[PDB]
Enzyme design. Structure first.
Site, short mmCIF file in Angstrom:
data_model
loop_
_atom_site.label_atom_id
_atom_site.label_comp_id
_atom_site.label_asym_id
_atom_site.label_seq_id
_atom_site.Cartn_x
_atom_site.Cartn_y
_atom_site.Cartn_z
CG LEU A 167 -0.10 18.51 34.84
CD1 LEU A 167 0.05 20.09 34.58
CD2 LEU A 167 -1.27 18.47 35.91
CG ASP A 168 5.65 18.86 33.42
OD1 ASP A 168 5.13 18.89 32.10
OD2 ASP A 168 6.74 19.72 33.36
CB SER A 169 6.26 13.27 36.25
OG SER A 169 7.21 13.96 36.34
#
Ligand SMILES: CCCCCCCCCCCCCCCCCC(=O)OC[C@H](COP(=O)(O)OCCN)OC(=O)CCCCCCCCCCCCCCCCC
Ligand SMILES: NC(=O)C1=CN([C@@H]2O[C@H](COP(=O)(O)OP(=O)(O)OC[C@H]3O[C@@H](n4cnc5c(N)ncnc54)[C@H](OP(=O)(O)O)[C@@H]3O)[C@@H](O)[C@H]2O)C=CC1
Ligand SMILES: CCCCCCCCCCC[C@H](O)CC(=O)SCCNC(=O)CCNC(=O)[C@H](O)C(C)(C)COP(=O)(O)O
Ligand SMILES: COC1=C(OC)C(=O)C(CC=C(C)C)=C(C)C1=O
Ligand code: SF4
Ligand code: SF4
Lengths: 157, 114, 75, 384, 198, 340, 174
Positions: free
Chosen positions: C35-37
């Site tokens: 999952l992205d930052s």
């Protein structure tokens, strides 16, 4: 006569006479062509004489005179106010800055004409369109209304 | 090299702000859609916000990132206080523009210069 | 004390761009989920709404573990 | 403090998104919005030659049509180190003042229309009208003349104008007197104007007010006496300084400069010299049409001047005059090219609006309307 | 020929040294133009200090800020040339203090020294993109609410990239990439012959 | 005869489609002129409504793109000059009420046949004729039955003339969606068979418009009888309630025999000023949507249909009370889809 | 030289005078007298169609292209009227007419773009483009305002008599 045609046309005319005799304008007063309109309202060229009221809010205004540059930020507003007026409404573009773009046509913040944001009925030309010229333009709106035949089209529709 | 710092001495100290703005924007979307009565999804709006933040994902320099959020924060302050109206918001969600293709066949068929 | 983990697990799977049955308490948003930052940011925020407590800007940075989030929420 | 977005058609020159938070009828904070009339005047000028950028200045603040043109003129003349001929100077002061009256008739009467007094506007717009006619018979246009060009005036006064700028001046006074009997002492004008928007002397200098707004607070500064431009040095007038600066006091000042300008106009009519109205350097001023149609050097100079331009020597200058609103200045950076490089227009008005916040504090909705009037805000100059 | 009064050229020159000595730091290239105008040039860090000395010095009171502007010389490494023009009511004189700022190297704000600058500094950010630290409220003053790009930059197209029209389908004003019906005719005007500098 | 297409694609660009569009003032029309104008096509809009009403169309067209010619259906000459210089003719001429001087057959069949005959004479490259969906010569509603007669005739006046056949249309200013929403005034909202067994598939107006426009600029469509339908079907029950749902107004579906109801339509039909409901309408409303078996329309012609729920919020917002206007579609519940 | 616009005993006579001013609204009555006075003055308005506000010879008004008496149009397409137009309004493209002379194939003044500066009147060497007196050319449609060579030449022919008189009156000045 009783032919319903002659019964109608006459009626329409009355309707046209009422709207054409009393046009209550509203002046967004963008820019300067507003100063040349205040002159119309002023004593040499009395607008009221013709039935045009000096001032009116949008709810009670028959015609909107867009005087002055319609810049991109003011463009959403113009529309709002045009959209907040009655069912029989009209727009008299005044000034080269609002007929087209005027000196500021190639600018990034000026809409090239108000007829790109509000449908325009009479275009009054001139950088400060002369007050007499506006008066000529308001009078041509009066001839435009006189010719309108709304009920005869209803009858023939 | 040798460049004075605007906001963050180093990128890890600036991403921080980027995120905080991300938080602020996240929460703002829902309120705007309702106040400005927009024709968009709360999730849709939040999607756009993501798009924007990512568009400028490539920036590596700390100074550029700081001014980007400087611009970003003023953007939401006008978005809030309803200074921007529906017309200035919906513009982000571009409409009435035929997305221009990028396929060479599409460019060759229409448009003299790609 | 587990009730927190019960709520935290419910929030992670509901957004639906993560945990497609790979949800694990030891699982780390950045380390394994990918999952992205930014997406994480969304997650922490999410947890804040269900918990009713808004966690600070920084501590979001330290917790990428649901289990660690429950650790902090209990405090 | 429910934001009322009070503003656009309001009581301003069309555009004032004056967003305001008002606890009931009290104003807590005024954040004026601007740019509803930004049009690009400063960027457009960079793409135009000096003579084709002169018409932009008339549009920057068009109530004061010409006085603005004088500021660019002066600026372009300084860069060229050329100065106008003697008759042209007097003309510019003649039409410079006529223009001041025109602005004050606008500012005082439009102020009243927002306040609610409507008869002063019609009384003085008839006088305005008569003045416009001077413009037209001198320039060709009622307003937006383009008469004051960078090297003097464009064409000598028609044969007979001076006499009429006399008949009018001989009478205008009574017309100012009348307005007075209606507003200066009205038991009600005073109330809505007195003690509204008082600005201290130190604060007025600090916020860069530079206009009647300073003069109204008692600071004595008229750029026309302190730094004379044209032949405003050869005339004699009294700056109308004010005390207890407030909307009423400044007003009285604007009525007094209408009075003092009639004193300056009289002189200009009494002492305007015989002579030419444009510099004789075909280099800067276009050649007379009889000359360009009979002399080769004049055609070449006519062709090059109209097609290419002055070719001002490289430099930069900030020249400020005393436009009716306040200090109007042009910072004109110029490369050796015929088209300018930058032309920031200092607008008396960008500074005045900013002061709206520090003036209208703890004031009612009606007070805000009175203060926008006492700053003579023409959104053209502010937005540029 | 303009009526130059050498009396001025000298007095202002003398003040220019005065200031140069008083603030040896932050002040370089002080010169009195051939137009009887002084233009102290200061390092960007000297924005606060040089102004304050001029606003509050008995021998140089420069109370009001006439203007704050930023020419943009694209060639110059430091693109912008912030120019502050100030007026002395007491001494009947004017001076110009000009600094240099690049796009992402902000200048200090002088709203403290003169509150007149509160608006002009917002104007410089909106048009040129220079940023002013410690400004109370920086925000677009002249451009549209959603405008992207700083307009007076020499690298910005005059017509710009977006224009507005009303679309019925969506019943709302809508930007579209600019499509002009007569492009700005770009007359080339420079003459290939110079003028022998006097 | 053609106009090479130059430009970038927006206003002030050229696409080379000169097109007479006789019934542009209409709800569908407005949209047809919009895209045609956006694309940069030359649009000739024949009009018999007063100039004040035609003003709304002026602004979407670029300078010189839109030309408005007067025209009378009974007068053959007016149609003649309109198509003189057009190469595409689009016919949207229909009125659900039968007015005193124009009978349903005249507007649906007589006026189009003459218009199509004129462009064959003119030499227009293609003619697009629009007739209602599910239209058969022995159908229930005269309007539909007639329209069916019409599509046939025009084929003989103009062979290989495209015949798009749209379903009732969903769009702001449409009837399908507004009509039901306006039943609010009526305390009870009659629904034949309690709004059942008349599954209906709406289609967004734009989709229809874009489709129509795409026809004008595509060789694949000749003699094609496309059917723009929609992205989801619906039993009239959910539709009615859904509408009332977004409008946030109560719903009382009430069964009323179509027999008696055809009579209610007759009543409004009696009214002189644009009857609100029509005997011919009523039938149409309870006339079940036909399953797509004709030539595919949307998607086939290049536009993916747009679900009703997506834009419903915009169409029904004005119908809503002052409160609930900030209510948005995703917090509200979208009704179920019945394909049947 | 400066002046104090508003820079400033209590006696019954004085006070009674002041109190009467507040109590019976004396100054307010003064203001009413002024307006009653004008009510009796002759109004300054003009019947607009019947009587026209005076415009002297230099009035710029509406563009026209003149012709030599002989009948040859004055313009020789030097195209500096295009060069000095501030608004980019005039568009001129030319080619040698069969006669061999130089004439403009297309001369288009966009009046909506034009800001009526009157420089074109100034710039023309043959003075072919002039600012004509007419100001009443308001048009129903935007396209009518765009003017090609034929409208301007036609405008020139219609108003040539007055244009010639106007140029006759003001040429010594120029
Ligand atoms: C034994 C004897 C017993 C009796 C003793 C009697 C003693 C003598 C009478 C004493 C009272 C006389 C005056 C009474 C009416 C006036 C009252 C008054 O004071 O007016 C209020 C106001 C004052 O003005 P202001 O400056 O705002 O207040 C100062 C103090 N704060 O004034 C105003 O603001 C007025 C604003 C008026 C706006 C409209 C003006 C219209 C003017 C023309 C019409 C005048 C009336 C015409 C009447 C026609 C007949 C009905
Ligand atoms: N909206 C719908 O219900 C659907 C309609 N259709 C079809 O699409 C077409 C367009 O629909 P829509 O826009 O709603 O129809 P409208 O009711 O809007 O009318 C369409 C146009 O037809 C014109 N018209 C009507 N009668 C006459 C006449 N006697 N002479 C000349 N012109 C006339 C009208 O012009 P004016 O009013 O100015 O006279 C109007 O501009 C219709 O013909 C219909 O068959 C298909 C599916 C659904
Ligand atoms: C619907 C509502 C409309 C609201 C739209 C909104 O206002 C406009 C907008 O979002 S304006 C986006 C600009 N936002 C940035 O420019 C941040 C850039 N931040 C970085 O570049 C980081 O330093 C980093 C290098 C870590 C990025 O790396 P990462 O890939 O994101 O992880
Ligand atoms: C003093 O300011 C004002 C103007 O400028 C003079 C206006 O033009 C207008 C516009 C009104 C007219 C009649 C032009 C208004 C309302 C105004 O308050
Ligand atoms: S047209 Fe001439 S006058 Fe009217 S606004 Fe534009 S510039 Fe000012
Ligand atoms: S200047 Fe006079 S002559 Fe030369 S082109 Fe323009 S109009 Fe024709």
């Amino acid at each position: 006569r009783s032919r319903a045609e002659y019964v109608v046309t006459k009626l329409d005319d009355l309707i046209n006479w009422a709207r054409r005799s009393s046009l209550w304008p509203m002046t967004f007063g963008l820019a300067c062509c507003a100063v040349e309109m205040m002159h119309m309202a002023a004593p040499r060229y009395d607008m009221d004489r013709f039935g045009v009221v000096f001032r009116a809010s949008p709810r009670q205004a028959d015609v909107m005179i867009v005087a002055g540059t319609l810049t991109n930020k003011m463009a959403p507003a113009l529309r709002k106010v045009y959209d907040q007026m009655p069912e029989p409404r009209y727009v008299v573009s005044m000034g080269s800055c609002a007929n087209g773009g005027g000196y500021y046509h190639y600018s990034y913040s000026v809409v090239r004409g108000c007829d790109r944001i509000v449908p325009v009925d009479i275009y009054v030309p001139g950088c400060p369109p002369t007050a007499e010229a506006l008066l000529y333009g308001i009078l041509q709106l009066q001839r435009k209304i006189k010719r309108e035949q709304k009920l005869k089209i209803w009858y023939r529709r | 090299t040798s460049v004075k710092p605007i906001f963050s001495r180093d990128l890890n100290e600036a991403k921080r702000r980027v995120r905080e703005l991300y938080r602020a924007w996240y929460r703002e979307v829902p309120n705007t859609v309702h106040l400005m009565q927009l024709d968009i999804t709360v999730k849709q709006g939040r999607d756009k916000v993501r798009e924007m933040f990512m568009k400028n994902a490539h920036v590596t320099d700390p100074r550029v990132v700081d001014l980007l959020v400087i611009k970003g924060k003023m953007e939401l302050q006008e978005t809030i206080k309803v200074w921007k109206q529906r017309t200035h918001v919906m513009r982000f969600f571009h409409e009435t523009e035929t997305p221009r293709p990028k396929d060479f066949l599409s460019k060759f068929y229409m448009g003299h210069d790609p | 004390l587990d009730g927190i983990k019960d709520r935290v697990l419910y929030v992670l799977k509901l957004y639906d761009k993560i945990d497609p049955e790979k949800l694990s308490v030891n699982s780390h948003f950045m380390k394994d989920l990918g999952l992205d930052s930014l997406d994480q940011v969304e997650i922490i925020m999410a947890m804040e709404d269900e918990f009713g407590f808004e966690i600070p800007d920084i501590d979001a940075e330290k917790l990428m573990c649901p289990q660690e989030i429950v650790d902090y929420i209990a405090d | 403090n429910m934001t009322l977005n009070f503003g656009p058609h309001p009581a301003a020159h069309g555009v004032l998104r004056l967003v305001l938070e008002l606890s009931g009828e009290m104003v807590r904070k005024c954040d004026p919005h601007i740019g509803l009339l930004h049009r690009g005047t400063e960027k457009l000028i960079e793409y135009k030659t000096y003579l084709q950028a002169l018409p932009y200045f008339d549009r920057l603040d068009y109530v004061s049509m010409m006085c603005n043109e004088q500021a660019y003129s002066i600026a372009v003349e300084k860069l060229l180190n050329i100065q106008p001929p003697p008759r042209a100077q007097w003309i510019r002061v003649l039409f410079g003042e006529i223009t001041r009256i025109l602005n004050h008739i606008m500012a005082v009467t439009t102020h009243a229309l927002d306040i609610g007094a409507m008869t002063p506007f019609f009384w003085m717009f008839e006088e305005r009208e008569k003045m416009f006619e001077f413009y037209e018979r001198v320039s060709g246009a009622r307003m937006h003349a383009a008469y004051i060009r960078p090297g003097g005036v464009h064409q000598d006064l028609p044969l007979g104008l001076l006499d009429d700028i006399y008949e009018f001046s001989k009478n205008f006074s009574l017309r100012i007197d009348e307005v007075e009997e209606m507003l200066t002492n009205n038991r009600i004008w005073r109330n809505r104007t007195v003690d509204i928007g008082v600005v201290t002397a130190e604060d007025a200098l600090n916020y860069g007010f530079s206009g009647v707004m300073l003069r109204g607070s008692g600071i004595q500064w008229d750029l026309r006496k302190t730094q004379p431009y044209d032949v405003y040095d050869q005339v004699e007038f009294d700056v109308p300084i004010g005390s207890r600066g407030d909307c009423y006091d400044r007003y009285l000042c604007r009525v007094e400069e209408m009075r003092q300008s009639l004193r300056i106009i009289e002189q200009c009519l009494n002492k305007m010299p015989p002579g030419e109205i444009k510099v004789d350097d075909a280099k800067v001023s276009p050649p007379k049409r009889a000359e360009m149609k009979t002399s080769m050097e004049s055609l070449i100079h006519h062709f090059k001047l109209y097609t290419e331009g002055y070719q001002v020597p490289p430099g930069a200058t900030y020249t400020a005059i005393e436009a009716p609103k306040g200090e109007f200045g042009v910072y004109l950076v110029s490369d050796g090219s015929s088209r300018p490089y930058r032309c920031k227009i200092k607008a008396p008005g960008f500074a005045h609006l900013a002061g709206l916040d520090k003036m209208s504090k703890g004031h009612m909705l009606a007070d805000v309307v009175a203060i926008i009037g006492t700053q003579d805000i023409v959104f053209g100059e502010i937005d540029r | 020929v303009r009526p130059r009064s050498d009396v001025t050229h000298k007095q202002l020159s003398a003040f220019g040294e005065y200031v140069a000595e008083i603030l040896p730091k932050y002040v370089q290239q002080v010169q009195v133009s051939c137009l009887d105008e002084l233009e102290i040039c200061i390092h960007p860090d000297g924005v606060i200090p040089t102004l304050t000395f001029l606003r509050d010095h008995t021998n140089a009171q420069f109370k009001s800020l006439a203007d704050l502007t930023a020419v943009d010389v694209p060639t110059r490494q430091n693109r912008f040339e912030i120019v502050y023009n100030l007026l002395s009511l007491r001494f009947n004189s004017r001076i110009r203090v000009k600094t240099y700022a690049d796009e992402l190297t902000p200048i200090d704000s002088i709203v403290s020294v003169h509150i007149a600058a509160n608006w002009y500094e917002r104007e410089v950010w909106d048009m040129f993109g220079v940023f002013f630290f410690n400004h109370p409220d920086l925000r677009r003053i002249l451009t549209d609410y959603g405008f992207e790009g700083h307009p007076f930059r020499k690298d910005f197209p005059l017509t710009g990239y977006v224009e507005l029209r009303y679309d019925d389908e969506v019943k709302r004003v809508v930007a579209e990439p600019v499509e002009l019906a007569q492009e700005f005719r770009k007359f080339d005007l420079n003459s290939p012959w110079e003028a022998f500098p006097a | 005869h053609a106009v090479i297409p130059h430009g970038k694609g927006g206003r002030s660009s050229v696409s080379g489609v000169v097109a007479t569009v006789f019934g542009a003032t209409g709800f569908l029309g407005r949209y047809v002129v919009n895209h045609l104008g956006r694309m940069g096509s030359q649009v000739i809009i024949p009009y018999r409504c007063d100039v004040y009403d035609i003003m709304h169309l002026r602004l979407m067209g670029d300078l010189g793109q839109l030309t408005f010619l007067e025209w009378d259906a009974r007068d053959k000459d007016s149609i003649r000059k309109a198509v003189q210089h057009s190469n595409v003719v689009i016919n949207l001429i229909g009125r659900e009420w039968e007015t005193r001087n124009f009978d349903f057959e005249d507007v649906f069949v007589n006026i189009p046949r003459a218009i199509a005959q004129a462009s064959k004479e003119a030499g227009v490259e293609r003619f697009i004729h629009v007739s209602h969906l599910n239209a058969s010569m022995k159908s229930s509603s005269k309007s539909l039955r007639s329209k069916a007669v019409g599509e046939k005739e025009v084929r003989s006046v103009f062979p290989e003339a495209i015949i798009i056949r749209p379903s009732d249309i969903f769009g702001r200013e449409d009837r399908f969606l507004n009509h039901f929403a306006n039943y609010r005034w009526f305390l009870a909202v009659p629904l034949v068979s309690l709004g059942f067994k008349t599954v209906k598939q709406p289609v967004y107006v734009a989709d229809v418009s874009k489709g129509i426009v795409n026809a004008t600029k595509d060789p694949d469509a000749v003699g094609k009888t496309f059917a723009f339908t929609g992205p989801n079907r619906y039993l009239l029950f959910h539709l009615v309630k859904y509408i009332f749902g977004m409008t946030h107004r109560t719903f009382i579906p009430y069964p009323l025999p179509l027999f008696v109801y055809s009579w209610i339509g007759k009543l409004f039909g009696l009214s002189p000023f644009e009857p609100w409901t029509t005997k011919d309408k009523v039938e149409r409303i309870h006339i079940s949507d036909v399953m797509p078996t004709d030539l595919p329309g949307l998607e086939d012609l290049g536009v993916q249909p747009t679900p009703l729920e997506l834009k419903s919020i915009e169409v029904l917002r004005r119908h809503r009370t002052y409160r609930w206007l900030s209510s948005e579609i995703e917090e509200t519940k979208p009704a179920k889809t019945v394909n049947y | 030289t400066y002046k104090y616009v508003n820079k400033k005993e209590v006696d019954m006579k004085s006070a009674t005078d002041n109190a009467a001013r507040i109590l019976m609204w004396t100054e307010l009555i003064r203001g009413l007298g002024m307006t009653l006075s004008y009510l009796f003055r002759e109004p300054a308005t003009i019947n607009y169609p019947f009587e026209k506000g005076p415009l002297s010879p230099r009035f710029r008004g509406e563009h026209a292209l003149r012709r030599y008496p002989s009948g040859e149009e004055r313009c020789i397409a030097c195209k500096l009227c295009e060069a000095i137009c501030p608004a980019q309004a005039i568009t001129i493209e030319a080619e040698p007419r069969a006669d061999g002379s130089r004439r403009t194939t297309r001369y288009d003044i966009d009046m909506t773009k034009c800001i009526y500066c009157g420089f074109c009147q100034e710039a023309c060497p043959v003075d072919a483009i002039v600012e004509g007196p007419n100001f009443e050319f308001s048009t129903e449609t935007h396209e009518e305002l765009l003017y090609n060579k034929e409208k301007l030449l036609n405008n020139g022919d219609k108003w040539e008599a007055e244009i010639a008189a106007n140029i006759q009156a003001d040429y010594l000045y120029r």
